[PDB]
Amino acid sequence: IQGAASPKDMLILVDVSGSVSGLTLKLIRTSVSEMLETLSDDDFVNVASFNSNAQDVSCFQHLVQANVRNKKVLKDAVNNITAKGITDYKKGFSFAF
Amino acid sequence: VRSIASLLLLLFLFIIIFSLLGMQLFGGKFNFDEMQTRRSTFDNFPQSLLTVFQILTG
Amino acid sequence: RRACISIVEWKPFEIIILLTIFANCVALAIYIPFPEDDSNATNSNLERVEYLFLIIFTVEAFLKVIAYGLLFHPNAYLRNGWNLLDFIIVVVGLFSAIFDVKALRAFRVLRPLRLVSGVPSLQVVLNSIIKAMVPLLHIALLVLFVIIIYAIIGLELFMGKMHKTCYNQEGIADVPAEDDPSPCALETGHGRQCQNGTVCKPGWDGPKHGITNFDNFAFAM
Amino acid sequence: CLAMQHYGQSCLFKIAMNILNMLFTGLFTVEMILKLIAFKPKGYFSDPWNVFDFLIVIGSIIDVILSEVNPAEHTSITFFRLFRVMRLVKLLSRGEGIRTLLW
Ligand SMILES: CCCCCCCCCCCCCCCC
Ligand SMILES: CCCCCCCCCCCCCCCC
Ligand SMILES: *[C@@H]1O[C@H](CO)[C@@H](O)[C@H](O)[C@H]1NC(C)=O
């Protein structure tokens, strides 16, 4: 992943809204934590989420370098997420950008 | 045929009522964290009619 | 004042009210019940259309009830034709407010039934079906008695005997060992014994989610 | 009283159930004695219904007798219990539509 690409600024927009309740949420929480494992130490990441209001799953509020540690905060905050409420792509992309 | 059609249409209305009520009670409530083996859910109307028919034939 | 309302039913609008019933059936078909309060645009529009349908039903309620009276209008198939609006009016009286409220929506599924009220060639066949149903209540009583007797016998015999399951003996994980657990019975009892590396010990697994066992009396029925 | 028994049963609950069982089998045995008084056994065993009730009564009383042992402390055949429910079938005969249809 170092030779194959240049440093990134990832920003995962998990969709924790009502319609992902159930199995779709178990795959989102798994797949997010399976994507934070493709981040080096010289590329940043944050994990937002939106259910008619876009917030952060973690306590970071900006990009956080994806160290061995910063990832653990994000992985452990993604795993403790729950589906609820309507889905709003406008307010959740206006938070990512 | 005027009476076969009437009987079948009344049956169809019974199935429609017990499928609208099916969506009202069990709409989207079948999401269990187990693998999605619930093919016969009540989610939308065509998938509710198949489930009500499957119950009907038992 | 009552004369115009009375001559309204002379005009064949009953077709338009039946078309309102059909439009209500179609408005209910398109409504997708998303799992946890989620919704799309279509479900948002259908609520405004639903306020429209409550309006067009309450109006005809006034018209048909003033021209036939409080003691004669309900004295027909029309009872639910009012009942259905009454509670659904309450739905508005609660929907703007916000609980147990969303489930109250279920009443609106009885509106298709009002359709068989409109056309008589279906009312006659429905009455035929119900009239044929009436003689079977003796069979229904016999089946009720059979269920009662056999549930009581099951209670006498199968009284909570379906819980000891085949857990793993090594003891680290107390999840039942088998992929599809089946109620076992430890030694000194009959039935099935576990394999070479497990223990048939109590718990709660037995049957599926404890829904189909014989413990209680409402489980036995 | 045959219907309330439920897995997860209180120790006092079983005792109350047994007291009620003794009371009810006693009333049915009193029925039996009174009916035998009303007409001698030569006039009793004509009706199959009374024979059926006699079997139910004797099974219940023998079960009460065998309850003397304590296989499970308040902390062995079960067959004669099943007579107690079976008496309910007699109640079914009250209706005449049911009686004629099944007959
Ligand atoms: C008799 C014809 C009935 C057809 C449907 C009537 C109600 C439809 C209203 C909403 C339609 C869905 C689109 C919502 C706007 C994007
Ligand atoms: C445990 C099985 C319960 C079902 C019993 C079947 C019918 C029992 C009653 C039969 C007698 C009917 C009337 C007799 C009149 C002489
Ligand atoms: C998980 O999220 C909920 C959301 O309110 C919070 O109350 C809880 O403390 C969180 N638990 C952990 C272990 O992060």
UniProtKB/Swiss-Prot annotation, chain A:
- After translation, how is this protein modified? Proteolytically processed into subunits alpha-2-1 and delta-1 that are disulfide-linked.
Q: Where does a divalent metal cation bind?
A: 15, 17, 19
The record places the motif (MIDAS-like motif) at 15-19
In which tissues does this protein get expressed?
Answer: Isoform 1 is expressed in skeletal muscle. Isoform 2 is expressed in the central nervous system. Isoform 2, isoform 4 and isoform 5 are expressed in neuroblastoma cells. Isoform 3, isoform 4 and isoform 5 are expressed in the aorta.
User: Which compartments does it reside in?
Assistant: Membrane; Cell membrane
* Coiled-coil regions listed in the entry: none
What are the glycosylated positions? Answer: 80
* Function (record text): The alpha-2/delta subunit of voltage-dependent calcium channels regulates calcium current density and activation/inactivation kinetics of the calcium channel. Plays an important role in excitation-contraction coupling.
Domain note: The MIDAS-like motif in the VWFA domain binds divalent metal cations and is required to promote trafficking of the alpha-1 (CACNA1) subunit to the plasma membrane by an integrin-like switch.
What does the similarity note say?
A: Belongs to the calcium channel subunit alpha-2/delta family.
User: Could you describe the subunit structure of this protein?
Assistant: Dimer formed of alpha-2-1 and delta-1 chains; disulfide-linked. Voltage-dependent calcium channels are multisubunit complexes, consisting of alpha-1 (CACNA1), alpha-2 (CACNA2D), beta (CACNB) and delta (CACNA2D) subunits in a 1:1:1:1 ratio.
Q: What else is known?
A: Binds gabapentin, an antiepileptic drug.
Q: Which disease is it linked to?
A: Developmental and epileptic encephalopathy 110: A form of epileptic encephalopathy, a heterogeneous group of early-onset epilepsies characterized by refractory seizures, neurodevelopmental impairment, and poor prognosis. Development is normal prior to seizure onset, after which cognitive and motor delays become apparent. DEE110 is an autosomal recessive form characterized by profound global developmental delay and hypotonia apparent in infancy followed by onset of seizures in the first months or years of life.
Q: What is this protein called?
A: Voltage-dependent calcium channel subunit alpha-2/delta-1
Identify the segment of the full-length protein shown: 245 to 341 of 1103
